[PDB]
């Protein structure tokens, strides 16, 4: 009843949530690594590794992993973020151990064949060319680069083409050696799962993983806090039909006391699409203004990103490159943040937001996979798992006042960074934005 936890002698944490009336489950290994653990010439390795982990291990050739997984009807997947590397599997309860076995095998005993490493450089490039076609993706990568100027969080996950062509098997093995420590990973599972047995299998297949010499609890500070840098980057692209803008301010980290309050505020501003509306029965003054007299943009989306020691909070805008004066939609957005700062918000919209927030964080924890996602990410970036009931509590206690306070702290006399891609001529300055916001 709740989430069971155990720690292996090498530092590895095993976190579990049993789900009654199930015969299948999800198990995943979460490693506090990701691109924020790389350096400038290193940049892109963790992702490169993820690709190779599926090419063969010291115990199983590539096609061997595939066929074995497909024969027991399991599923195997992985992903890399700026904060971590995750490998996970979905399978019938009978195969949980087989699953743990294979996960550890792919993570730590991967071959990394030189032929494989060279063929893969092309795939990764191809992948890079695809991200370049997703304007939102592009804008947010640039935003991270200037906001976290010359810092780990400022680098992308894929890395520069330059690095994709230069990463060497040595780079790969070093990254593994440096980062893969028991005290830096979590084996999370949910579904038809026995915690005690899973801890055993953990020891059996992951026990061989090295402890860091200077262990630190998963939650403890990586080191010097990332620092938010105000800045702007205009990327002129007259050929683009739509223009994309992202405006941010230093946000909140995963463990921040005001974490949920920040999400609550994001939800009060919400989103809007020129065609669909808000997806709310009652639109905000901002949404109404956006849609009036011809529309001021195609869409806007409030966003919030969190990391263990930092966060970004802001707006993402999409405008018609030939029809919209970006200045006008930016003004309305700043007007809306000021509305919140001046307390001019209703009980009803505050309640609407808390309800939106609770559903988004809780009703979405439906299958074992989503639950493993939550267990894993929380423990690996925070050191603990707030339970669904605890999160409910955190959201439910938020007051109109909490929000007004938070906005007045984070959106008044604080730096902002911005990125614009497309028809830049109509986009306002970062000093323009702070002037109007603090005004």
């Amino acid at each position: 009843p709740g989430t069971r936890t155990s720690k292996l002698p090498n530092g590895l944490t095993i976190a579990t949530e049993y789900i009654p009336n199930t015969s299948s489950a999800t198990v995943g290994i979460f490693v506090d690594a990701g691109s924020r653990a790389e350096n400038v010439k290193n940049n892109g390795t963790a992702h490169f590794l993820q690709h190779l982990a599926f090419k063969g291990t010291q115990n199983r050739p590539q096609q061997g992993i595939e066929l074995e997984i497909e024969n027991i009807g399991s599923h195997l997947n992985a992903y890399t973020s700026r904060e971590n590397t995750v490998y996970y599997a979905k399978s019938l309860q009978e195969d949980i151990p087989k699953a743990v076995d294979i996960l550890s095998d792919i993570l730590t005993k991967s071959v990394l064949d030189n032929s494989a490493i060279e063929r893969e450089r092309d795939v990764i490039i191809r992948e890079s060319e695809e991200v370049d076609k997703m304007y939102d993706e592009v804008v947010f990568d640039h935003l991270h680069e200037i906001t976290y100027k010359d810092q780990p969080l400022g680098r992308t996950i894929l890395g520069p083409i330059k690095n994709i062509k230069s990463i060497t098997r040595t780079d790969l093995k070093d990254y593994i050696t440096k980062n893969y420590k028991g005290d830096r990973m979590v084996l999370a599972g949910a579904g038809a799962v026995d915690h005690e047995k899973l801890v055993q299998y953990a020891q059996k297949y992951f026990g061989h993983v090295p402890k860091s010499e200077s262990p630190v609890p998963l939650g403890s500070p990586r080191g010097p806090l990332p620092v938010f840098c105000r800045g702007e980057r205009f990327i002129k692209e007259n050929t683009l039909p739509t223009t994309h803008i992202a405006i941010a301010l230093e946000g909140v980290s995963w463990s921040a006391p005001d974490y949920f309050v920040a999400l609550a505020t994001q939800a009060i501003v919400g989103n809007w699409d020129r065609a669909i509306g808000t997806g709310t029965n009652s639109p905000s003054p901002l949404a109404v203004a956006a849609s009036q007299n011809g529309s001021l943009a195609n869409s806007y989306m409030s966003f919030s990103t969190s990391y263990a020691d930092s966060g970004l909070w802001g707006m993402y805008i999409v405008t018609d490159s030939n029809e919209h004066n970006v200045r006008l939609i930016v003004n309305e957005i700043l007007k809306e943040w000021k509305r919140i700062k001046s307390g001019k918000i209703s009980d009803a919209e505050v309640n609407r937001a808390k309800a939106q927030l609770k559903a988004a964080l809780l009703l979405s924890l439906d299958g074992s996979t989503a639950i493993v996602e939550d267990i894993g990410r929380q423990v690996v970036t925070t050191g603990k798992r707030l339970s669904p009931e605890e999160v409910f509590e955190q959201v439910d206690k938020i007051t109109k006042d909490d929000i007004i306070m938070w906005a007045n702290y984070r959106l008044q006399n604080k730096p902002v960074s911005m990125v614009a891609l497309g028809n830049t001529s109509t986009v306002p300055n970062v000093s323009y934005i702070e002037e109007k916001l603090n005004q």
Binding site: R82, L263, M301, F303, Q356
Partner: peptide, 13 residues
Amino acid sequence: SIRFFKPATRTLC
């Protein structure tokens, strides 16, 4: 999309 949160991630999708 429709309403919330948004971090970056690459997947062997």
